[PDB]
Amino acid sequence: AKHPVPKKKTSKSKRDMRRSHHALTAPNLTECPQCHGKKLSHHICPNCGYYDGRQVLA
Amino acid sequence: HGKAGRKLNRNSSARVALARAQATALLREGRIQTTLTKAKELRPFVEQLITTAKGGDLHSRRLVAQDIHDKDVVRKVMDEVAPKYAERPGGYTRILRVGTRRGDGVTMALIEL
Amino acid sequence: MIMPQSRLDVADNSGAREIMCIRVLNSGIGGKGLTTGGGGNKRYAHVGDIIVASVKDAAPRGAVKAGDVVKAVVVRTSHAIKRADGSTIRFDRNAAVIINNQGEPRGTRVFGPVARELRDRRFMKIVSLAPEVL
Amino acid sequence: MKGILGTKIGMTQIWKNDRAIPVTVVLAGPCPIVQRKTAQTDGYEAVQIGYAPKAERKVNKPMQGHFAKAGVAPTRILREFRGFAPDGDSVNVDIFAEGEKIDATGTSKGKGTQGVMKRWNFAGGPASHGSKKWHRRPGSIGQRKTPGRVYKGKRMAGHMGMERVTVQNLEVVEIRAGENLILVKGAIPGANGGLVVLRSAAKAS
Amino acid sequence: QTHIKINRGELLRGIEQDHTRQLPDFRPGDTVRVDTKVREGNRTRSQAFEGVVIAINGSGSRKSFTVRKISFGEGVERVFPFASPLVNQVTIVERGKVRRAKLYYLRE
RNA sequence: AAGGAACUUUGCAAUCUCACCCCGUAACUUCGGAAGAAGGGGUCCCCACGCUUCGCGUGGGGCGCAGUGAAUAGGCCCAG
RNA sequence: AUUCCUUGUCGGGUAAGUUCCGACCUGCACGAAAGGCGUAACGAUCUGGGCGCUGUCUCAACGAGGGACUCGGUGAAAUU
RNA sequence: GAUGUCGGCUCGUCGCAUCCUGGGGCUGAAGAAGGUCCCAAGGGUUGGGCUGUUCGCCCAUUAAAGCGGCACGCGAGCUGGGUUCAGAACGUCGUGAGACAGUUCGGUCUCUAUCCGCUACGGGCGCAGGAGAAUUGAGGGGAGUUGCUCCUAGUACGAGAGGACCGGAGUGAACGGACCGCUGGUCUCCCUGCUGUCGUACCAACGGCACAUGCAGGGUAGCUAUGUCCGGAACGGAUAACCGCUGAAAGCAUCUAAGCGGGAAGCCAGCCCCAAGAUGAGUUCUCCCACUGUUUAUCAGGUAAGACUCCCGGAAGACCACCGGGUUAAGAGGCCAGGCGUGCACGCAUAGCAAUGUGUUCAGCGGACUGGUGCUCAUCAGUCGAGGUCUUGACCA
Numbered sequence A: 001a002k003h004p005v006p007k008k009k010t011s012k013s014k015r016d017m018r019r020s021h022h023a024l025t026a027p028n029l030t031e032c033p034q035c036h037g038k039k040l041s042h043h044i045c046p047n048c049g050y051y052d053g054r055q056v057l058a
Numbered sequence B: 001h002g003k004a005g006r007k008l009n010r011n012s013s014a015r016v017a018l019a020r021a022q023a024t025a026l027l028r029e030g031r032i033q034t035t036l037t038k039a040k041e042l043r044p045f046v047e048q049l050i051t052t053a054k055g056g057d058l059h060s061r062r063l064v065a066q067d068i069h070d071k072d073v074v075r076k077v078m079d080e081v082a083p084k085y086a087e088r089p090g091g092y093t094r095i096l097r098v099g100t101r102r103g104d105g106v107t108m109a110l111i112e113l
Numbered sequence C: 001m002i003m004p005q006s007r008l009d010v011a012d013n014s015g016a017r018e019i020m021c022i023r024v025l026n027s028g029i030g031g032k033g034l035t036t037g038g039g040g041n042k043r044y045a046h047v048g049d050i051i052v053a054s055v056k057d058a059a060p061r062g063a064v065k066a067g068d069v070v071k072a073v074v075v076r077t078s079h080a081i082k083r084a085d086g087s088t089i090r091f092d093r094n095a096a097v098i099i100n101n102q103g104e105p106r107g108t109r110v111f112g113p114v115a116r117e118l119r120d121r122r123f124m125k126i127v128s129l130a131p132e133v134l
Numbered sequence D: 001m002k003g004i005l006g007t008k009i010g011m012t013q014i015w016k017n018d019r020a021i022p023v024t025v026v027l028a029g030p031c032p033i034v035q036r037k038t039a040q041t042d043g044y045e046a047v048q049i050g051y052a053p054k055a056e057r058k059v060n061k062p063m064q065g066h067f068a069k070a071g072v073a074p075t076r077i078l079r080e081f082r083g084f085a086p087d088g089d090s091v092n093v094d095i096f097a098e099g100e101k102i103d104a105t106g107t108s109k110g111k112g113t114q115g116v117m118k119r120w121n122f123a124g125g126p127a128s129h130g131s132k133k134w135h136r137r138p139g140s141i142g143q144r145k146t147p148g149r150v151y152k153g154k155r156m157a158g159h160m161g162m163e164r165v166t167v168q169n170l171e172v173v174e175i176r177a178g179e180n181l182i183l184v185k186g187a188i189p190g191a192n193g194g195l196v197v198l199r200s201a202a203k204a205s
Numbered sequence E: 001q002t003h004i005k006i007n008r009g010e011l012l013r014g015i016e017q018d019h020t021r022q023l024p025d026f027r028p029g030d031t032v033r034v035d036t037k038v039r040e041g042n043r044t045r046s047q048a049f050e051g052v053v054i055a056i057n058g059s060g061s062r063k064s065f066t067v068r069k070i071s072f073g074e075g076v077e078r079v080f081p082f083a084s085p086l087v088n089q090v091t092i093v094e095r096g097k098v099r100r101a102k103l104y105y106l107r108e
Numbered sequence F: 001a002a003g004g005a006a007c008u009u010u011g012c013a014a015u016c017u018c019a020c021c022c023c024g025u026a027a028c029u030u031c032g033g034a035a036g037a038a039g040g041g042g043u044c045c046c047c048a049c050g051c052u053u054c055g056c057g058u059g060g061g062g063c064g065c066a067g068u069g070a071a072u073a074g075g076c077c078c079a080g
Numbered sequence G: 001a002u003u004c005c006u007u008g009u010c011g012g013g014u015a016a017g018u019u020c021c022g023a024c025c026u027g028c029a030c031g032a033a034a035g036g037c038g039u040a041a042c043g044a045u046c047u048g049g050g051c052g053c054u055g056u057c058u059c060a061a062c063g064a065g066g067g068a069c070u071c072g073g074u075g076a077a078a079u080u
Numbered sequence H: 001g002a003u004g005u006c007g008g009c010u011c012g013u014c015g016c017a018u019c020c021u022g023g024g025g026c027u028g029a030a031g032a033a034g035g036u037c038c039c040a041a042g043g044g045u046u047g048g049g050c051u052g053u054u055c056g057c058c059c060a061u062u063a064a065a066g067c068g069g070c071a072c073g074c075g076a077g078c079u080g081g082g083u084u085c086a087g088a089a090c091g092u093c094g095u096g097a098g099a100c101a102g103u104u105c106g107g108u109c110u111c112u113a114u115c116c117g118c119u120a121c122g123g124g125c126g127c128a129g130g131a132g133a134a135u136u137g138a139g140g141g142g143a144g145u146u147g148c149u150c151c152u153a154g155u156a157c158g159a160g161a162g163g164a165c166c167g168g169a170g171u172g173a174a175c176g177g178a179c180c181g182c183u184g185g186u187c188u189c190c191c192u193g194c195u196g197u198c199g200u201a202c203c204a205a206c207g208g209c210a211c212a213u214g215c216a217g218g219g220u221a222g223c224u225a226u227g228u229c230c231g232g233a234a235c236g237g238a239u240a241a242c243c244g245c246u247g248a249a250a251g252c253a254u255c256u257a258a259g260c261g262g263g264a265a266g267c268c269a270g271c272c273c274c275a276a277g278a279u280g281a282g283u284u285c286u287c288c289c290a291c292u293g294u295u296u297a298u299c300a301g302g303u304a305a306g307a308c309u310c311c312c313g314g315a316a317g318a319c320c321a322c323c324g325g326g327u328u329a330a331g332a333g334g335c336c337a338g339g340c341g342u343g344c345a346c347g348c349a350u351a352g353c354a355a356u357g358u359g360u361u362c363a364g365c366g367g368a369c370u371g372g373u374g375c376u377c378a379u380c381a382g383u384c385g386a387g388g389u390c391u392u393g394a395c396c397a
């Protein structure tokens, strides 16, 4: 058949313990020096399209 | 280990096709939006292309034609762009990071000259 | 780099034309005849090393005839030999000289150049018949 | 005991009399003596030495204090040497002699995850007479019902390299003080530009 | 690892000029190379190896050239460090016309 | 690299060989065969001369490590 | 492709041959259309040897691509 | 309602009734070579030919080519030769269908590991303030083999032939570790050459495709062994068999009854590596320093020293982790110079009927190497992180 197979159901406890590292880390959001919508460090502000001057359209 | 120093993600032929492909795009358009990595690999190949063109002689032209298979882009690079870069000690390529895509979730970037 | 099964050109007139390695030994030569082994492992014979061998091709009329289990000293090798100054020697073909149990040649003369390493390894009589000692 | 810190520069080919010698060049730069460990203060005898210079801006407040106490200049590398108590601020001149046998130590080049064939000189298996285990793969990890376990220590694939390695009794071929250089016969562990720890033979012959 | 502001290139070059030897303007073609065989006990011999330069690998201390000869019916190749103390002098016997740097084809 | 079956139940596997032209070819035989036996040589470019073409032969000359220059492409033998 | 005793015995080939070839006859338990002996040619047949070549091997290395690893999308299974 | 069965390979570990090497006692031990018994398990214990073979026989060596255990160790590790499926044959038995003590050729070995176990690597929290760094070593692991030659010395011994112990030098083998300077290997586009065909209008020069490099020749960094460099130890302490000192019981004798010394490749220590989750959580240096909060929100919140996040990279790496840089900037790229590799570029001129050759040109081109240089991006920010419990004692204003 399907050669190595689990021997016993993994308990609600054991299953959950394994998920103690699955939690997403929230982005470190910065506020744009211009358009004043929040942005990602080292990226162009989505809203105004600025990164010192304006690079992207809108 | 692997202390080499280059970067592919396809087969020999393809790595060269992509390089030349995007190099023609940037040189023709002046600014292209692509994947970050893809853009990173492009930066030196295109930067090296400008230096060849910065020769001005037929050989320098013919050398560019080995990578740029567009009759017009080769003229744009030879006669227009390379001369404008005359006193720039190499460096005209800048990469800005735009931000994550929907499908693959890939972080996009801009590359302009 | 000679090892059991390696076939080699014979650099003498002992009658043998081609010998085949049977055993790489830890090549004696001192006081009495040749000395007894410096271990039983030892995978490669180099120039100046003694090997045990079976004769595969022998000339009609000669001391050594086919299928004789014999001793020979390696005189030439395709595998490069390195000298203390930094110099390297390497020969197109590997060759050996059949010897008796006191390490003296079995033939009257030696053919082609021999490695200087034989001189160091105390093989006086071989190095004496030798046309060149590169 | 009498030791120093340097940087692996490279390997070259050099002659002494009529024979060629493979040499590892070490820049055993000047070492500020920064802390003297005494049985009275620390409970054992040692010297804390320093190695490459650090820009004052790059140095944090706590490390500035540690250096200012000895009144040096900030370094980057700090190591101790047991039972070695010199006077002043440690340099190879008079420390090592031309000919002296030494104990070169460093961190081996790291080869990341390496399987049993490279990591332990295994054997793997047949490349042709029927296989699914073609070359690398270990064999049997154990036995049967008996130690229904696998021996602790069992040689297995893991991260290979990037370990502390000491190479005993290396000849001091040449010394170029002022240039702060030392030529060593043979191969010291680690890569060029790596930290090296040259000392007195651990136990000389 | 020790991030010292250093020119390892030059530092190596420094401990190498004292063990570097300029030899004649040769590329392939024939040459008499005059080795000094001190190794014949206390007696210092002189043997000359004369053949075609097949290769020229290396630079600095490590620069060497490969000579190929046919001696008493058997092919011989010698590799010499330019700065080998057992080398006395190499001399262009005659210059050759080749279309590459390695000429290993001469092995057949 | 050097070695070349030492692998192994077993050269299993994987190489070598590889097209066309010329020379050449064994025991044995039901005289058909065995035979593509085995083995060896040639092969590209230019010019001039000859002919039966799409092409070929002879001469001289040229270039490369290499000329079925890449793809398709028999390993062979002895004995049961 | 038959033999137990058996790796019979002697010779061949191998440095060394429980297999293989050849003799011998003591055929446990060959034998004449359940055909006996032989036979050129044919065989993806089976056995044994040789030349060639080789990563099968001493003894493995480097390199490539596709997985394996990482992220974003969708998300099974035997088992318990 | 299934514990896969011989041999091989791979991988080991363990017993000692020890094959070698180490120490001894007796010998029908002169010496050398042995015999035999005792102590001793640290390491070592070769490659082939025949057979499915384990075994055994042979070849050639060796210090030696040990015997056993681990489900006749190991198939969720590999093989599948042997044996025990279905085809087929021979011998034999059976009237037969079939059969074996047999013999012969053939014959599917099941991608995903849940727990324990094992190798690597992180996240968490603890270690009575928050931090940067240097560390002791309780403990643990690795390693541990041996020949040959010379000197002692042609001495001891021996009638001679021969020929040492003890001590002291060298040099291998196999194993291991590191390393890439050498010698080589590779180096999937760094350089050149070559074919067919298609394209860039044509010529000339190039590009694609012929592998997931079309093929060939070479090759830097890197990685690599077949290439180098080092290694097993010396000294010590306690022992083993064993050899002895002092010495009674037993006016002698006795190595023992009390005491003491010596004595092994073994034991502990020494060598190399890990190591304070050593919850028994150790030590040293250095830094910051006592902030705010209505009996309505009983500890949260600004912050320090310091770090993380993000970015650009790395002889670090699966991911994490680790090291470096982040404009107060040479981190990476580019660019400049150099090295190194390839081996003489395109274009033009000349020579020739042409193929081609010569010059210009040690050309030209150029991955990873060594520097330099502010041309490009390391922008801008955000997040987090102390204000130190109690009891006793001692010193103190």
Ligand SMILES: CC[C@H]1OC(=O)[C@H](C)[C@@H](OC(=O)N2CCC[C@@H]2c2cccnc2)[C@H](C)[C@@H](O[C@@H]2O[C@H](C)C[C@H](N(C)C)[C@H]2O)[C@](C)(OC)C[C@@H](C)C(=O)[C@H](C)[C@H]2NC(=O)O[C@@]21C
Pocket (backbone or CB within 6 Å): A001, H002, H004, H109, H110
């Ligand atoms: C390839 C997949 C295929 O498996 C196989 O064919 C292998 C090769 C076969 O092996 C084999 O049949 N064999 C025959 C002998 C060699 C090989 C084998 C045996 C054991 C282990 N490995 C290989 C099995 C292991 C065999 O079991 C074995 O049966 C033996 C009767 C007893 C064994 N026990 C003791 C553990 C058992 O494992 C059975 C009978 O199958 C066919 C198992 C049963 C459950 C079955 O029918 C599966 C559904 C089977 N059918 C399918 O489509 O998929 C499967 C999984």
Ligand SMILES: [Mg+2]
Pocket (backbone or CB within 6 Å): D123, D124, D125, D126, D127, D135
């Ligand atoms: Mg293998």
Ligand SMILES: [Mg+2]
Pocket (backbone or CB within 6 Å): none
């Ligand atoms: Mg099992």
Ligand SMILES: [Mg+2]
Pocket (backbone or CB within 6 Å): E057
């Ligand atoms: Mg080379």
Ligand SMILES: [Mg+2]
Pocket (backbone or CB within 6 Å): F080
């Ligand atoms: Mg017959």
Ligand SMILES: [Mg+2]
Pocket (backbone or CB within 6 Å): none
């Ligand atoms: Mg996913």
Ligand SMILES: [Mg+2]
Pocket (backbone or CB within 6 Å): H005
């Ligand atoms: Mg059974």
Ligand SMILES: [Mg+2]
Pocket (backbone or CB within 6 Å): none
């Ligand atoms: Mg004894």
Ligand SMILES: [Mg+2]
Pocket (backbone or CB within 6 Å): none
């Ligand atoms: Mg190299």
Ligand SMILES: [Mg+2]
Pocket (backbone or CB within 6 Å): none
């Ligand atoms: Mg190539």
Ligand SMILES: [Mg+2]
Pocket (backbone or CB within 6 Å): H262
């Ligand atoms: Mg004692």
Ligand SMILES: [Mg+2]
Pocket (backbone or CB within 6 Å): none
């Ligand atoms: Mg930082």
Ligand SMILES: [Mg+2]
Pocket (backbone or CB within 6 Å): none
């Ligand atoms: Mg640079």
